[PDB]
Every structure is written in C-alpha cells, then in structure tokens.
Ligand binder design. Structure first.
Ligand SMILES: [Cl-]
Ligand SMILES: [Cl-]
Ligand code: NI
Ligand code: NI
Ligand code: NI
Ligand code: NI
Lengths: 218, 217
C-alpha cells in the first residue's frame, strides 16, 4: 500500500548512516550486519515473558532499523581523535565519547517535530545515546546500570561488540567466531545484561552465518 | 497515515543534514534558509511555461526538500582542509571539491538500493554533485555549462550564494540585502542562469524577509 515511502526512507537512512561511517569506517558492511544481529537477538527475546510486552513484532522491526543510526554522532569527533589508533588522554576520550550525546541531540530534535510520536525515532535516540552503557554502570556517557539502560541500547551494545570482534581493524584480522563467543560470554553481568548473553548464545550460530554472508569485501 | 511517514522523513532528513554541517558550520540556520530560498525561486519559475513541465507542484516540493542534502558530502573532507581559513594548495582544493562527488555517490547508492525512480533522490543527487557548477562552465567538479547543468543545481547555486553573502563569515559581516541583490545580478550569464537571476529579482523582497527572520543566533 504505502511501501513506496517506507522503502524510500529505508534507502535514504541506509545511505546517510553509511556516509556517517566514511571518516572512521569506510568500505564496511557494519551497518547491515548490525541490523541483522539486532533483529536476531530481538526476535529470540520476544518469545520470552520478561520482554514480550516491550518487543512486539512492530517494535522489533523499528528497533532493528533504528540501530543503523547508533554512531551518526561521530561528526562531533575531530579527525585527530577519531583517527588516533593509540591511547587517548582524558580530554580526547571525552571528545570520542561525545558521539553519543551528539547523536542523541539530533534525534531528539527530530522527535519534537512530530505530532504523533515515533517509535522509530525514540529507539534511535535511546540507542545513539546509550549504546556504550554497560550493565555494571561503568560505561558512558551517564553510567546507567541494570534495567535503567533502555532495552534497545542493551541489545545494540552486544551486537556492536560482536561485530567489532568479528571484523577487520588496523591492529588485527577478525577474531574467529568461537573466540568471539567466549569473549561476549565473559562480559555477562559486567558489560552486558546476562539475559541478552543467554539469548546471544542460543542464536550464535545464526550470528556466524550473518558474519560470513555479509563479510566485508577484500 | 501517509502524513505520519512524510513528517518522519522530513524530520530525519533535517536532523542528518544538520549533523552534516556540524564540522564546518555549527549553530547555523543555513538549512532552513536555503530550503526557503530554493522554494521561492522554484515557485516563481513554475509559473513560467518554459520551466512548468519540469517544475510541477510535486517536483517543487521534492526539489526543495532535497536541497537540504547539498553539502552532506563534506564528511569526505578532512578537518585540516575544511577548517583551514587561508588559501589552499591545489591538492587540498581538490579534497574540498570532492564534497560534491562523495555526496553524489552516497545518494546514487541509495537510488540503487531503492531500485525504482524517486524524484526526491534524483534531485538530491543532482544537487549534491552540481551545486558548485557555473553557468559559464568554470565551476566544479565537471565544468558543466549552460543547460547541461541540471535545473535543480542551478537553482541551488543561486540560493547558496545569496545565503553565503547575507550571513556571517570570518572575513566579514553579512552584506546588506540591497548589495547582495546587485551582486547576484552581476553574476547573470557567468555564475548563474540569467533566467534564474530574473526570477530572483522578482522574489528578492521575500529573500530579504527569510534572511532576517531565520538569521543566526
Ligand atoms: Cl544471513
Ligand atoms: Cl519567512
Ligand atoms: Ni558503528
Ligand atoms: Ni558508538
Ligand atoms: Ni551548505
Ligand atoms: Ni557545497
């Protein structure tokens, strides 16, 4: 019926999120992988009582598409910080962390424009802000902890770590799947909601399939 | 229902275009000004028979909204170039110019994803690529001339120059409206299509109003 506009939105968002990665992550399939990793975890969690209210099939879809915007705030990070492979002094680390606030601000201003609130923009905004929060309260930028982190950001944090481990960086090749799994498991209760780790372990073979099929070009 | 999605698209595009200005033009109302300067010109041209085919009222609306993405490509320009206030050596100048190509490529890859015709994406793409072309063939990145520059990019080039003259820079304060008008008239047949200059002259008072009301804080 109104697919024409929904497809146009998806294409535009995909294109521009991709530009937003150009400075620190060019030539990557990060974004379509993250989307699928998020969807898989969200689908599995949706079958369980603790999450089914929040994760309706409509919510799962919006959540997954909004995960594409997690890092659009990186334009607030100067080249010298973003392209520095080494360790950062504390004021530069603060600039790198501010990617979350900048993404949050832009998306919240977009929300205030709408008469009928948008689930899409609300998930996108929660994710952009809170995707580097840690279950134990030691992440950034607010140090939220436990169920005070929005569910969408908790899902994305795990997807994002899996993706980072199983893709290329200047310092190394991707880690093998089995090792990434042990590394994500190790973060249960510190980095990640232990229930999301449990969901991840049940879908991990599907994660390995996405990582292979949507692998970066050589 | 269709409104809900159209309002969502407008909100998201504006947010992302605004993030695209953050590095070299933070705290600015460039984008809402530009959109209105485009719409004003386009609405006047649409009256004319010569442009009326291409500028239907639907096209006017898409054209205007797509103009927001003109400089989205500036993420391909390194900080050291983009933040340099002086004259640029020729290889840095080439990197600055490549904002047009990088915007083009992102929007074309979106047209490929979508795989059906979108007036919105087509306008956006043409604008991002050609908004610094000059009627006399001396612009960049291709040196297109005359009617070989897409109409949308010809409209945006004029709007963009007006905005740049009547807003702040490190070198100077804004030019007064009356002087900016003369200056734009002076570019007829070199920078700009002379028929767009005619249209600009007929809507100039409205341009002055947008410039004042949407002035930077
Ligand atoms: Cl797959
Ligand atoms: Cl006005
Ligand atoms: Ni990312
Ligand atoms: Ni991030
Ligand atoms: Ni601009
Ligand atoms: Ni430009």
């Amino acid at each position: 019926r109104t697919r024409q506009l929904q497809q146009l939105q998806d294409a535009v968002i995909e294109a521009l999120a991709t530009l937003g990665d150009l400075r620190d992550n060019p030539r990557s399939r990060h974004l379509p992988r993250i989307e699928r990793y998020v969807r898989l975890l969200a689908e599995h969690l949706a079958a369980q009582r603790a999450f089914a209210d929040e994760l309706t099939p409509e919510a799962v879809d919006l959540l997954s598409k909004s995960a594409l915007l997690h890092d659009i705030g990186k334009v607030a990070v100067p080249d010298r910080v973003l392209l520095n492979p080494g360790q950062l002094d504390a004021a530069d680390t603060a600039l790198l962390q501010g990617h979350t606030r900048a993404g949050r601000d832009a998306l919240a201003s977009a929300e205030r424009r709408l008469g009928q609130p948008s689930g899409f923009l609300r998930f996108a905004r929660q994710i952009a802000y809170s995707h580097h929060e840690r279950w134990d309260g030691r992440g950034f930028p607010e140090g939220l902890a436990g169920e005070r982190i929005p569910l969408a950001a908790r899902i994305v944090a795990l997807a994002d770590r899996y993706d980072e481990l199983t893709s290329r960086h200047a310092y190394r090749p991707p880690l093998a799947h089995a090792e990434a799994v042990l590394l994500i498991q190790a973060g249960a209760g510190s980095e990640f909601d232990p229930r999301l780790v449990e969901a991840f372990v049940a879908v991990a073979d599907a994660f390995a399939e996405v990582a292979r099929r949507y692998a970066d070009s050589a």
